[PDB]
Design an enzyme around this catalytic site. Structure first.
Site, PDB file in Angstrom:
ATOM      1  N   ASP A   1      52.456  46.090  54.734  1.00  0.00           N
ATOM      2  CA  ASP A   1      52.065  46.475  53.776  1.00  0.00           C
ATOM      3  C   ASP A   1      50.497  47.520  53.145  1.00  0.00           C
ATOM      4  OD1 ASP A   1      54.321  45.355  52.102  1.00  0.00           O
ATOM      5  OD2 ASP A   1      52.486  43.540  50.742  1.00  0.00           O
TER       6      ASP A   1
ATOM      7  N   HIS B   1      40.230  41.767  51.488  1.00  0.00           N
ATOM      8  CA  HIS B   1      40.538  41.922  52.133  1.00  0.00           C
ATOM      9  C   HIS B   1      40.894  41.869  53.995  1.00  0.00           C
ATOM     10  CE1 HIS B   1      42.988  39.773  49.037  1.00  0.00           C
ATOM     11  NE2 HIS B   1      43.525  40.706  48.351  1.00  0.00           N
TER      12      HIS B   1
END
Ligand SMILES: O=C(NO)c1cccc(C(=O)Nc2ccccc2)c1
Ligand SMILES: [K+]
Ligand SMILES: [K+]
Ligand SMILES: [Zn+2]
Length: 397
Positions: A99, A141
């Site tokens: 991802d 993140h």
């Protein structure tokens, strides 16, 4: 003034990723279409004297080897040839895969957000602006040596580090659908950066943290009690989300007395986001939880950085952040922003069909978390010798 980060090169880079496409252009062009740009001070992204100065800035958080690997990933994706097994393994060791894929501009794209958010922090520190918005930043993140959740460099951490190093305390508020794990982790041991994330959490939902792990972890060492979290079940609407975080926000400001506030305003809590988990809106008379939260933070009159983040319905994200931008102008300057319910004609007008309206097209556990969070805030104040009035803070809930 109210600053906002943009520029021609910045716009091109923020629109160069496969995951976020041209979202930033829609956001900035809708802000432009509503005639808000003349109200705003343009904040130019930071540029550096040399590669070494750039590395010095980015490796204030990230490891040199991770930055090297991210730059190599870009280089490799600018050649036609497939990666070697050795290079695949190198990238895997930094989670630059799956991802968080490579693409030809991945390093320039990632670095651009850092440049924008570091410049935004500097504009607050030198008092050129009282609030700065960066809709190209907010990538919460990314870790010291790990990409995660299409976040490659943590512009938030780097911006907060600049602010706290400019007794300076920073309050970080993360409104994204997802737990702000990268920022929380960066400052896990730091009492002077208090992090607060409100998010969905449930089994298997990314990134997995911000909830019972069982007990609730909240910082370590001298940072004990300094990382706050409010996990919420799916389906929450504007009002309940607002009532859930309102008293926490007010208590944090009263007790922490932050010198700066940094807000991540990821739009993936909107009812129309493809995640389809929360039911928040951009409605401005229910009152959008986002606008309620931003209005409350700005009422503190603390220098504030407002960042983007998630948001995968690109027109509705622009709809929301345009209203956040107008609200910030109103609250900071004191000048009423009258916005037509029709999307004005402009470059991306067709993307707002078929309705072409500014409103998005949408028609006990929390009490326990409040008692837990109040106790943690008392523990934080005790450990850090912050004088505060307990009864007044209790009355907020
Ligand atoms: O927003 C995030 N973190 O703050 C995030 C982190 C990891 C994955 C995704 C993700 O791919 N979301 C998505 C869902 C449906 C349709 C399009 C995109 C989003
Ligand atoms: K969040
Ligand atoms: K902390
Ligand atoms: Zn998100």
């Amino acid at each position: 003034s109210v600053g906002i980060v943009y520029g021609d090169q910045y716009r091109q880079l923020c629109c160069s990723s496969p995951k976020f496409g041209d979202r930033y252009a829609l956001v900035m062009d809708l802000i432009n279409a509503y005639k808000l740009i003349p109200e705003l001070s343009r904040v130019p992204p930071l540029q550096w004297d040399s590669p070494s100065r750039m590395y010095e800035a980015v490796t204030a958080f990230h490891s040199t080897e991770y930055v090297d690997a991210l730059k190599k990933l870009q280089m490799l994706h600018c050649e036609e040839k497939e990666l070697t097994a050795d290079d695949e393994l190198l990238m895997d060791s930094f989670s630059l895969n799956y991802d968080c894929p490579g693409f030809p501009s991945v390093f320039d794209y990632s670095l651009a957000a850092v440049q924008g958010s570091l410049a935004a922090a500097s504009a607050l520190i030198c008092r050129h602006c009282e609030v700065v918005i960066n809709w190209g930043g907010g990538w919460h993140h990314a870790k010291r040596s790990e990409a995660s959740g299409f976040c490659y460099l943590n512009d938030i951490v780097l911006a907060i580090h600049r602010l706290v190093s400019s007794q300076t305390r920073v309050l970080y508020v993360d409104l994204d659908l997802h737990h702000g794990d990268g920022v929380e982790e960066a400052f896990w041991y730091s009492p002077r950066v208090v992090t607060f994330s409100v998010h969905h959490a449930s089994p298997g939902f990314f990134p997995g943290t911000g909830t019972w792990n069982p007990i609730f972890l909240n910082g370590a060492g001298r940072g004990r009690f300094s990382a706050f979290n409010l996990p919420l079940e799916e389906g929450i609407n504007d009002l309940d989300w607002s009532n859930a975080i309102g008293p926490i926000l007010d208590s944090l400001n009263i007790v922490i007395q932050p010198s700066y506030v940094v807000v991540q305003c990821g739009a993936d809590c909107l009812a129309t986001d493809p995640h389809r988990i929360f039911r928040l809106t951009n409605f401005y008379p229910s009152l959008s939880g986002y606008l309620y939260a931003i209005k409350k933070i700005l009422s503190w009159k603390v220098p504030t950085l407002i960042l983007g983040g998630g948001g995968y319905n690109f027109p509705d994200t622009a709809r929301l952040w345009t209203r956040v931008t107008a609200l910030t102008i109103e609250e900071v300057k004191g000048k009423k922003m009258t916005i037509s319910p029709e999307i004005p004609e402009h470059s991306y007008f067709s993307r707002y069909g078929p309705d072409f309206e500014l409103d998005i097209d949408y028609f006990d556990s929390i009490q326990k978390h409040h008692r837990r969070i109040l106790e943690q805030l008392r523990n934080y104040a005790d450990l850090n010798k912050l004088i505060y009035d307990y009864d007044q803070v209790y009355q907020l809930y």
